[PDB]
Design an enzyme around this catalytic site. Structure first.
Site, PDB file in Angstrom:
ATOM      1  N   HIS B  43     -33.068 -49.447 -53.268  1.00 35.49           N
ATOM      2  CA  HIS B  43     -32.708 -48.474 -54.020  1.00 35.49           C
ATOM      3  C   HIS B  43     -31.833 -47.368 -53.619  1.00 35.49           C
ATOM      4  O   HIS B  43     -31.371 -46.652 -54.189  1.00 35.49           O
ATOM      5  CB  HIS B  43     -34.190 -47.682 -54.482  1.00 35.49           C
ATOM      6  N   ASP B  99     -38.027 -54.080 -52.612  1.00 34.55           N
ATOM      7  CA  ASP B  99     -36.921 -53.028 -52.240  1.00 34.55           C
ATOM      8  C   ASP B  99     -36.426 -53.370 -50.822  1.00 34.55           C
ATOM      9  O   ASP B  99     -36.815 -52.629 -49.863  1.00 34.55           O
ATOM     10  CB  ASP B  99     -37.883 -51.680 -52.297  1.00 34.55           C
ATOM     11  N   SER B 198     -36.836 -42.791 -47.316  1.00 34.82           N
ATOM     12  CA  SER B 198     -36.811 -43.993 -47.823  1.00 34.82           C
ATOM     13  C   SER B 198     -35.668 -44.886 -47.066  1.00 34.82           C
ATOM     14  O   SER B 198     -34.597 -44.200 -46.845  1.00 34.82           O
ATOM     15  CB  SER B 198     -36.671 -44.050 -49.346  1.00 34.82           C
TER      16      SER B 198
END
Ligand code: NAG
Ligand code: NA
Lengths: 39, 251, 34
Positions: B43, B99, B198
């Site tokens: 992402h 992810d 992230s």
């Protein structure tokens, strides 16, 4: 003590929200790097 | 990183900052796994809900960093991307399943005291370490709280949480390609990753060979450091076969 | 490329010097299913 993750390989209405900035915070206070890298 | 502390110098030599060229911005954490292969979250490069879709020429990787903001000349090094490899089965629509993404650098990075790769877990190492209660280490430059930003890299130690507890903590469908970590309310202590972290690594030190293995990637959560909620991490070991197919095909 | 590069996971400023960081003991001491 249980396995929090399975030990195998991935042989192949509510949405998760990634821990990713969304309001331009990643630019706050950033000192500009040398222009040679910016190309 | 919420309820973390300042990283020590060289404590996380595999920490990478995914960096946007124009405007110059922090994009994500990332990790160095070889001389020209950097691991991150998918992402960070592709998230359609927020209309995010970066190509290799948009981004740089800053390795060896400590300060979030200062350009640390002679210590940090900055590399360019040759190719991005997003997992073919990455699903952003529902639960950020798989992810994970790889980035190949144009030129191999020179290792130093602040630039060094992390290991990926084998079946034996993963099996003995990915157990509820065992603590891993999360690093990043993201938010210090949900409700601002650190001057230097942040580190927090968090325990792996039992899958039933992760499943019951959220209404979002959990898959076997993710695990969750953090303290329960009964445990008193606090800590979590937050927006800006992230793509960074969840790592564990092996008591067999003294090596650090990356077991997770900071993926998603519901808020940061909430009682009864836990941060979710991409399960690196389940995807390690794909990671290798990319480094052997296009290495 | 199995677990990574031959020197992976061994930090120059710690493992390669036989020095521990300030919180790595907490990680090892959690390795007990209790
Ligand atoms: C992302 O951008 C590239 C352009 O380089 C495009 O080919 C690709 O289809 C895009 N992916 C999306 C929008 O999901
Ligand atoms: Na929590």
């Amino acid at each position: 003590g249980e396995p929090g993750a399975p030990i195998d390989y991935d042989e192949y209405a509510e949405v998760a929200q990634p821990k990713l900035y969304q309001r331009g915070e990643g630019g706050n206070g950033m000192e500009p790097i040398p222009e040679d890298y910016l190309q | 990183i919420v309820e973390g502390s300042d990283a020590e110098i060289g404590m996380s030599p595999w920490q990478v900052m995914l960096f946007r060229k124009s405007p110059q911005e922090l994009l994500c954490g990332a990790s160095l796994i070889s001389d020209r292969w950097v691991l991150t979250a998918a992402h960070c490069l592709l998230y359609p809900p927020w209309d995010k879709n970066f190509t290799e020429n948009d981004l740089l990787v800053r390795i060896g960093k400590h300060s979030r903001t200062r350009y640390e000349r002679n210590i940090e090094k900055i590399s360019m991307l040759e190719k991005i490899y997003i997992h073919p089965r990455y699903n952003w629509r529902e639960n950020l399943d798989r992810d994970i993404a790889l980035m190949k650098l144009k030129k191999p990075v020179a290792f130093s005291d602040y630039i060094h790769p992390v290991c990926l877990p084998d079946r034996e190492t993963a099996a003995s370490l990915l157990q509820a209660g065992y603590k891993g280490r999360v690093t990043g430059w993201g938010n210090l709280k949900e409700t601002g930003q650190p001057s230097v890299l942040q580190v927090v130690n968090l325990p792996i949480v039992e899958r039933p507890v992760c499943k019951d903590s959220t209404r979002i469908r959990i898959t076997d390609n993710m695990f969750c970590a953090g303290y329960k309310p009964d445990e008193g202590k606090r800590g979590d990753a937050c927006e800006g972290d992230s793509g960074g690594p969840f790592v564990m030190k092996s008591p067999f060979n003294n090596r650090w293995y990356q077991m997770g990637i900071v993926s998603w959560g519901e808020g940061c450091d909430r009682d009864g909620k836990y941060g979710f991490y991409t399960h690196v070991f389940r995807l390690k076969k794909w990671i290798q197919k990319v480094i052997d095909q296009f290495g």
